Design a protein around this motif. Structure first.
Motif, mmCIF file in Angstrom:
data_model
loop_
_atom_site.group_PDB
_atom_site.id
_atom_site.type_symbol
_atom_site.label_atom_id
_atom_site.label_comp_id
_atom_site.label_asym_id
_atom_site.label_seq_id
_atom_site.Cartn_x
_atom_site.Cartn_y
_atom_site.Cartn_z
ATOM 1 N N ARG A 13 0.847 -1.199 0.000
ATOM 2 C CA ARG A 13 0.000 0.000 0.000
ATOM 3 C C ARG A 13 0.879 1.244 0.000
ATOM 4 N NH1 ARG A 13 -2.941 3.163 3.810
ATOM 5 N NH2 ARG A 13 -5.186 3.382 3.383
ATOM 6 N N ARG A 14 0.340 2.384 -0.446
ATOM 7 C CA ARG A 14 1.112 3.639 -0.494
ATOM 8 C C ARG A 14 0.486 4.851 0.222
ATOM 9 N NH1 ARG A 14 2.347 5.559 -6.046
ATOM 10 N NH2 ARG A 14 0.048 5.538 -6.186
ATOM 11 N N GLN A 15 1.241 5.934 0.310
ATOM 12 C CA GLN A 15 0.724 7.118 0.982
ATOM 13 C C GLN A 15 0.145 8.238 0.078
ATOM 14 O OE1 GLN A 15 3.238 8.182 4.645
ATOM 15 N NE2 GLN A 15 1.352 7.160 5.348
ATOM 16 N N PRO A 44 -4.205 5.492 -2.324
ATOM 17 C CA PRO A 44 -3.186 4.598 -1.784
ATOM 18 C C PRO A 44 -3.079 3.278 -2.543
ATOM 19 C CG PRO A 44 -5.110 4.467 -0.445
ATOM 20 C CD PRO A 44 -5.331 5.626 -1.381
#
Lengths: 124, 138
Positions: B68-70, B74
């Motif tokens: 997952r990303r910021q 996401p």
RNA sequence: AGCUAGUUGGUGGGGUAAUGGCCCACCAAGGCGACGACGGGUAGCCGGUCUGAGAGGAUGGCCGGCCACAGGGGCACUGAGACACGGGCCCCACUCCUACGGGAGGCAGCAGUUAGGAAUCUUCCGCAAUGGGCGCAAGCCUGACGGAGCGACGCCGCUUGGAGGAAGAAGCCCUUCGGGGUGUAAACUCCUGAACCCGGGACGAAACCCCCGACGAGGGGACUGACGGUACCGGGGUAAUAGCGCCGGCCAACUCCGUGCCAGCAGCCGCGGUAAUACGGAGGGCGCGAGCGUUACCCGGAUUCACUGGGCGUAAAGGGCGUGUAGGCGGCCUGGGGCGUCCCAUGUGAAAGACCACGGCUCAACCGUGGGGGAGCGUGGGAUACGCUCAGGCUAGACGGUGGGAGAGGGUGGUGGAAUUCCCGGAGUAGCGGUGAAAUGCGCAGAUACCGGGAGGAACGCCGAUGGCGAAGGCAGCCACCUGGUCCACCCGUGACGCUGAGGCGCGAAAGCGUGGGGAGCAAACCGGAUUAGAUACCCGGGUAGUCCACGCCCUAAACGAUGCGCGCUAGGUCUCUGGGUCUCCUGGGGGCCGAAGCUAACGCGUUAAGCGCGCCGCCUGGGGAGUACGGCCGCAAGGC
RNA sequence: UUCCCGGGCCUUGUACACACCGCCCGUCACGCCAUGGGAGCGGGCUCUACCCGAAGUCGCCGGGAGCCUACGGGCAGGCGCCGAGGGUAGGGCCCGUGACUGGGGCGAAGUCGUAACAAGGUAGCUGUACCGGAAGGUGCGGCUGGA
RNA sequence: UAAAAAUGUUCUGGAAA
């Protein structure tokens, strides 16, 4: 289109059309002015452009422009057509070359003289 | 009636990978499994496995993504970024061993079908064989 | 868009170095064509050359290979070879000689002339070299060739000087009149020495040949240089050419004056109308330099015909819709073949060119030697995943069977009520009608409004839609008969039988056309009234085609979702039609709306895709000219394609 | 507070933006230019059939006619087939040209109107048909790219 | 979706910014 449709019909080359039929593409072409008048330009602009109507050695009678200020052409002066159109003159698609045959260079010209016949003055 | 089994398979993978699906089903074909075996070894998917949907032979491909990303959106990065069919029935594509394409400077792979089996660009090059160029994946 | 009589094949001949209808009798009827025959236009092909990141595009001049031709044209003779560039025969046209009956020539060999043209060279020297013919040889011939000449036509090398030299001469130009610029530029000082002069002066040339050895091998000997008294070298040696374009933006380069939409500029956008970095001149600057610009043509940029590498809802672009021929394309398992395809080997791929390395001319341009590429196609060997082919096996695509369903889907006949018009009969009187207002018009020869009866034509209110059916156009009272599509359920049968579709064929709103029929209401055209500056219109009063039926033509549309057909895949929410359900709701087919992901220039589209994919078809390459003309096909015409 | 004038704020349509004192359509008239039709005229190329038919190979003859030798034969010479070209006639393709004529493009400041763009003042567009100086109008049906 | 409402014309060529 489908590859199959290309295989069948295939693409089509463009084929450019010349803006100057001076036959054989001939860098130039010789002729004689049969009419040497002054037409009124297209729009935005107003003036009295001097244009000659010349009969050619291509077998064509076209109307051309006499560049520069002040010229010496009459109803029979042989002339060398150059090809180069003029934006305001609806009809003119060629330029008369100054300094060849009856076409005199531009008397007293001192800048870009090469583009107007006009030899070269001796600083005398 | 489906005109290109493989093309379809590549597409079904693309479609679900892009909607972060856990796994995707595709009709079974021995040839197709081959592709998949390669897709798993080079690491693009988590793996496949012959299974049976409503009494008919299917292949269940298990997708793999990134973490997952910021920030906004996401949605994780994708392991299978690209996957395009090269040779299709409307125009086949065969390549000599010298002619074999190099996918993404090396960070990608093409999948050939050769007289020695469905192998990758590296495998095909090493084995000096060439073939039909099924697809490319990066 | 169809073409073919020596045409296509046969048998026996002639012919030839030889195959063959190459030619000939006889026989048979064939051959060729949308995979583009026949025909029309243009053109010699290639190695290569230019351009391009590449795939490509353009091109075929010099040099090298092949072909063809020799004033136009036909033919043969000699011969190893020619149907023969400087041989022959003949016709022709042209030009010339002639003692007029017959003779002569053919520069697209080298120089040269004239014509045409924007334009393309010396009637040069030498066979010294290389190469050729003939000769035992000496040697002869050789405008092949080796050189020389002319032309900045191109490439490359070189020159017009170098070092000093002023808070900076003059002149010219600007100026806030202090000054600033041209400018170390000049002048001026030294310094080198392009040219030119004198002397010297090549390589390319060593064998043919001669002598010893056998006229073999090997060794030695002699003759020979067109370019040239040139390159080159030694000594001497003078400051010794500069131009062309451009300076608004693209694009490097700005001021003053002149002019005043004038004169002129202009590749594109555009500059000029009294303060113009755009016209013209000057100063100054920028670029390039024996050059610098201009015109023409090729590639690029132009992913702007897109293979690499584009598109079509609204920018150009989905065919009006079906059915389908050729074609293209094609599910799952297995086996044989190995055409596609891939691999090894091998033959071929001339030279030059290109690239790289290294060399030779003082360098470079040129030039030599060596090196490396090369697909293509031939041959032999091998592989079998995928495509292909034969074969066997399957059922998920497709079709069929049984049982059911909804529906303005279609054709034919019949029939029901409302309403309009007209006619007859009542009854009744003064206006009705129409508009913004009116007028025409109709009416006291009795209209309008009212009741009754009749005839006749056309269309079907409510239901009724945000509905349904159809491939499209399109379909609406009710009943019956004939008939198409289509969907659900059971999963019963066949066993890839599939998708798509250039042509073809069929259908195809309205208007329109041909026969005949029909004609109430409506209504192009046409006639009034009114409006208006006018009114060939809008409004009002009339009205003929037509609208209606039959049979046959016509073939268009904003024939529209401006969105081709099929299949797979990719959140949901909601309303709705029709089917099945273990009728909370699920599940199938259809009609809508909002919206995941994603897509789009945006608007928007979004399981009814304009998303993500594969197959096939149609179509688009700036606007106008123009859906026009010419041609062809079609039609009665109008017109359509 | 309907209306006439100027104006606030929201909204809608637009082809306007030099901004409705805006934009813009067709005929007519005037000039240049390219182009279709047009009694027909002049050509280039091409095809068929026919008559004349040189040189030359080829096939017969080679005789009441000449000559040869290496004279069973040969040559000269005659006949024929084909044949360049010429000639009559008729087709096909293309090019030039023609009184007059059709529309087209272009052209600083011409004439008439006002079709369209804002229910553009009669919503517009559209296939067809008739009509009209001109834009265009009306009929029938269709579209929304109108309310 | 159903969808009423206006008799009445015109403004030379360039350039604005």
């Amino acid at each position: 289109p489908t590859i199959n449709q290309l295989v069948r019909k295939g693409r089509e080359k463009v084929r450019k059309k010349s803006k100057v039929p001076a036959l054989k593409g001939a860098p130039f072409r010789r002729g004689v002015c049969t009419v040497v008048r002054t037409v009124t330009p297209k729009k935005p602009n107003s003036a009295l452009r001097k244009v000659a109507k010349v009969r050619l050695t291509s077998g064509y009678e076209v109307t051309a422009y006499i560049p520069g200020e002040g010229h010496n052409l009459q109803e029979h002066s042989v002339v060398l057509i150059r090809g180069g159109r003029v934006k305001d003159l609806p009809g003119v698609r060629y330029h008369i070359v100054r300094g060849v045959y009856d076409a005199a260079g531009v008397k007293d010209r001192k800048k870009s003289r090469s583009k107007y016949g006009t030899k070269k003055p001796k600083e005398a | 009636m489906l005109t290109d089994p493989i093309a379809d398979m590549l597409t079904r993978i693309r479609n679900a990978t892009r909607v972060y699906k856990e796994s995707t089903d595709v009709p079974a074909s021995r040839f197709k499994e081959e592709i998949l075996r390669i897709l798993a070894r080079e690491g693009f998917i988590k793996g496949y496995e012959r299974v049976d949907v409503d009494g008919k032979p299917y292949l269940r491909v298990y997708l793999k993504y990134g973490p997952r990303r910021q920030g906004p959106d996401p949605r994780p990065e994708q392991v299978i970024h690209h996957i395009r069919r090269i040779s299709k029935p409307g125009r086949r594509v065969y390549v000599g061993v010298k002619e074999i394409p190099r996918v993404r400077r090396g960070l990608g792979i093409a999948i050939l079908s050769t007289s020695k089996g469905v192998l990758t660009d590296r495998e095909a090059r090493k084995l000096g064989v060439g073939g039909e160029l099924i697809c490319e994946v990066w």
